[PDB]
Symmetry: C5
Subunit: 205 residues, 5 copies
């Protein structure tokens, strides 16, 4: 592990702190959602609770290295606190997000970072009609809180939310779940605003 | 990039910690509220829960720089923990405020700082009459906890609360929402006390 | 702010940490309560919830300075963590106190410190009779947890609790609210124990 | 306070961190309980909530000093975070313990330390029969989580569980309370395992 | 105590931070569960709460020492924060795990580390049939969040969950409780993925 210690030392100790993206050096964050369970619906406050994992991927030149210079190390694990991470936020939460997984990322020699936090989110949704056959739809937008599209571009690898881990005995079954990039401009202002819309149609099982 | 790292280093590492405003060097904080949702009303304890964003703006000379000296950088993002922030507080909360957004601010070359925390607040309100057509009104004052008007002056850019992001399917519809600066004096003391009164009239949809 | 930075540097960096009061160097803390709201009563667990602010005042010689030596600065604000604060505690709480205000204190050139934390407290009270006209009384003692009267003396500026901010549309109306210093001596021990008894008589409005 | 500052500096800054007790240098921790209130009983989950103070005493040679060398100071108060504390744990809690008091300890020149945290504990208890005259008994064991009796010896000081502060208007009255040391040996192993059993018989008042 | 201070200084201060396991230097973590109580079942959200201890064991060469070089010290206790710990996570939790015990580990001269955190976990389980004689089964998988089987190998010392500490008066009795290692290979990828499946069959007592 001499090499791994050296690599991490070189990237984090013997280097200045990365100050985040800018208009001159933008970055693309790829988002994907894996939905585990709709745990709870509150029809008296219009709040729905969702447990899901949020795959985040991005690439920084300042996290690149040549494996040949570090004993053929091609990737490593590190605390998410040791590196810059994007400020992706649910735009319609009603409680602080609860983190269900360790805050550790994987960094690869090409400078890519993968970070998959598991979370429980309460967000605004009217569940009226959930008890019917057609079910009910709601949506929650995710995006940067402080960075516009000039600094952080969002995208997805697919529009289909991963349902392969959805709890088989959930009180609610997922009829449909998509994740879609949206770009909006406003007339006042030059900068685009980008978000990913997670739209889920579900009903009582 | 190199310039942004140098700029931040110069402003935060190679400079002393700003000790807050004083009577000799006062500052103006501009507040605006964007109301997302009246989530919940408890008629048995007279508490209402509100999700909103609070736009805060102010300007410090010690955060000024000349863009020409730093590769034409006109603004940057930084953790709210790295800079001084005003102690704006709801005066009639009944629980600690829950923060729903990343604590990151934007700092501009003229020394202006923008910080828009999303929050959920429980505050004192009697919701009696909410189920009627005329609805119900309540109010909450915001202001500095420890600074008088000689140190921190508050103001608003408008008296109208921004309702453009209010949840369309909330259990409650906003009939009216204003934000107004008030100045008060006490007999003992020469210094004015300033707050912003957020007043919201709402009812069941 | 050059002077304020120098003053704070001189008082906190270029000085040893104040180790708290002792029998040889005692101190007096003045307490006053402002009661905002009796938020909740639980008659099935005998717990009452109170929102209030607790004004605390004391004076330390080691926080004195001459204004003429520091650009006529007569006072400043500082984080409550930077200074010693007294360990005043409710003696009959049933949950951790929730802090509703920034932890910032005001220090004046004579060495006086003001600190006014807003708090929500759950404490032991049997609310039986609250629904009647005569109402119900209960009480909670506040005092130091670790210091006797030889080290920390408590007092009040008045026996009347400040009710001027009591929520007009609270579910409960305050018939009476007092704050009284009490001394107790024990046979074993020479040192007195001091507390302030907050007594509140209230009923359903 | 020059001497107190020097004493604390000498004991904590100019000294290495105490690494905890060992078989060669064992430690006795005395425990005593003061029961304030049985706040709540949940007969649907078999959980009972208790508010109490837990007096903890022990002695470290590395906290000794000669009063003559420090202006006749015989004791002082300090944050519990500044000193080693024993890992005494309730063995049958169902929630994290809630601390209701300041975390401050008293250290005396002979190296003794007193620490009396106030706590609310949820622990496993079947309250069936609590509504009858005979009441119900349950118990909670306290002991070190990682130290055997070769490193930490537990004991109790007073005869009795202190009921002198028990809330007079609690929903539950204490019929009886004991605290007793228990020592267990296993065939495999030479080292004894020690706990203190708090046993409380109570009923509805 | 001189030796223990020296040993700890040598292992933690005068040694580089262990960067975690890799494919070249893998690690085996042994897991065992002790189940204390099924505290709660929510049939309306399909969540079950478990209080249990999770015994974790592993071995690092960089924590080895020769007892003869350190006054025959064969083991010591240290804060879990001072050492690397594995990122073992419940894969179907619905809330953050609550820690019920001190975060302290035991390190032995052969470089083995024992860490037994007590925890309360909420996880996904349909309790339908719990009130019948046959009872109900559910399961939760534990494993590394970021490490594959090439870096962290999991195993158990026994398939039987330790029920010797199960609360005798729990609302639920355990009919059966097992812990089993499972290996999954995927077609895309050479690396195995490993978890331990805790399966519990229980019913109302
Ligand atoms: C739910 C959500 C989430 C996020 C990240 N932003 C906004 C928002 N309204 N943003 C803004 N809203 C406005 C705005 C909104 C209404 C009227 C005028 N301006 C202006 C802005 C200018 C710069 C940056 C953002 C805004 N809303
Ligand atoms: C230079 C800059 C940078 C950033 C990150 N935001 C804003 C801005 N105005 N933001 C917002 N502005 C407003 C806004 C602005 C004017 C009037 C009403 N609302 C609302 C928002 C709501 C959510 C998030 C942001 C805003 N401006
Ligand atoms: C909820 C809130 C928030 C803030 C920032 N201040 C106050 C307040 N009462 N301030 C004062 N209140 C009083 C006061 C209040 C009641 C009765 C008599 N005096 C006197 C003051 C004198 C000088 C400065 C302030 C006060 N209250
Ligand atoms: C919430 C809040 C915030 C702040 C900053 N001050 C106060 C306050 N009461 N201040 C004072 N309050 C009183 C006061 C308050 C109640 C009754 C009598 N006097 C007197 C004062 C005298 C000099 C300076 C301040 C006060 N309250
Ligand atoms: C969910 C979401 C996320 C983000 C990042 N922005 C917005 C938004 N409405 N933004 C803005 N919204 C408005 C707006 C929205 C409604 C009516 C009038 N103006 C104006 C803006 C002007 C400048 C910048 C942003 C806005 N909404
Ligand atoms: C609710 C409360 C709050 C505080 C601050 N102290 C005490 C208390 N009992 N203190 C003491 N209680 C006793 C005590 C209590 C019961 C029986 C015998 N002794 C002895 C003490 C000796 C020195 C200092 C304190 C005590 N109780
Ligand atoms: C030298 C010294 C200094 C201080 C600050 N306290 C005590 C002490 N015994 N305190 C307490 N002692 C007891 C106590 C002591 C003996 C038997 C039963 N209870 C209870 C307490 C409850 C709350 C606070 C303190 C105590 N002793
Ligand atoms: C509630 C509680 C609290 C504490 C501090 N320890 C234990 C415990 N079971 N400990 C042990 N339990 C066992 C054990 C338990 C069941 C079956 C076989 N072995 C072995 C041990 C070996 C060394 C040290 C401890 C144990 N239980
Ligand atoms: C050298 C050492 C030091 C310490 C502190 N514990 C243990 C140990 N085996 N502990 C335990 N071992 C077991 C255990 C061991 C074997 C089989 C089943 N259970 C259970 C425990 C439960 C609670 C606490 C400890 C244990 N060993
Ligand atoms: C609310 C409160 C606050 C404080 C500071 N002390 C006490 C208390 N009971 N103290 C004591 N109570 C007793 C006590 C109480 C009942 C029976 C016998 N002794 C003895 C003490 C001896 C020394 C110091 C204190 C006590 N109670
Ligand atoms: C509950 C849980 C816990 C953990 C630790 N991982 C996963 C998971 N799905 N992992 C992965 N899932 C996929 C995956 C899942 C669905 C469809 C396609 N790919 C790919 C992966 C590639 C590398 C590493 C992990 C995965 N799920
Ligand atoms: C190099 C590396 C390291 C680690 C720790 N994870 C992954 C990974 N792909 N993970 C996952 N990958 C996917 C995934 C990957 C590709 C396509 C679809 N899904 C889904 C996941 C769901 C839950 C947890 C993890 C994943 N990759
Ligand atoms: C409540 C409690 C508290 C403590 C501190 N230890 C234990 C315990 N069972 N310890 C052990 N328990 C067992 C055990 C317990 C039940 C059945 C079989 N073996 C074996 C052990 C072997 C070595 C060391 C400890 C144990 N239990
Ligand atoms: C519960 C759990 C735990 C862990 C550690 N992994 C996985 C998982 N599905 N992993 C993967 N799942 C898939 C997957 C799963 C469903 C459908 C298609 N692909 C693909 C993967 C490819 C590479 C690595 C992992 C996966 N699931």
């Amino acid at each position: 592990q001499a090499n791994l210690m050296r690599l991490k030392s070189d990237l984090f100790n013997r280097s200045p702190m990365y100050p985040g993206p800018t208009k001159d050096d933008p970055l693309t964050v790829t988002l994907g959602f894996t939905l585990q369970d709709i745990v709870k619906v509150d029809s008296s406050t219009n709040e729905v609770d969702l447990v899901y994992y949020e795959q985040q991927r991005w690439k920084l030149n300042s996290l690149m290295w040549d494996p040949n210079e570090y004993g053929n190390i091609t990737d490593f694990r590190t605390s998410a606190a040791d590196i810059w991470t994007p400020d992706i936020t649910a735009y319609s939460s009603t409680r602080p997000v609860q983190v269900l997984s360790p805050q550790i990322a994987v960094v690869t020699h090409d400078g890519s970072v993968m970070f998959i936090p598991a979370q429980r989110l309460s967000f605004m949704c009217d569940p009226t009609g959930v008890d019917s056959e057609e079910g009910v739809t709601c949506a929650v937008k995710f995006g940067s809180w402080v960075y516009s599209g000039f600094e952080i571009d969002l995208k997805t690898d697919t529009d289909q939310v991963d349902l392969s881990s959805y709890y088989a005995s959930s009180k609610y079954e997922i009829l449909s779940a998509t994740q879609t990039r949206q770009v909006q401009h406003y007339s006042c202002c030059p900068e685009p605003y980008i978000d990913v819309n997670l739209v889920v149609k579900f009903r009582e099982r």
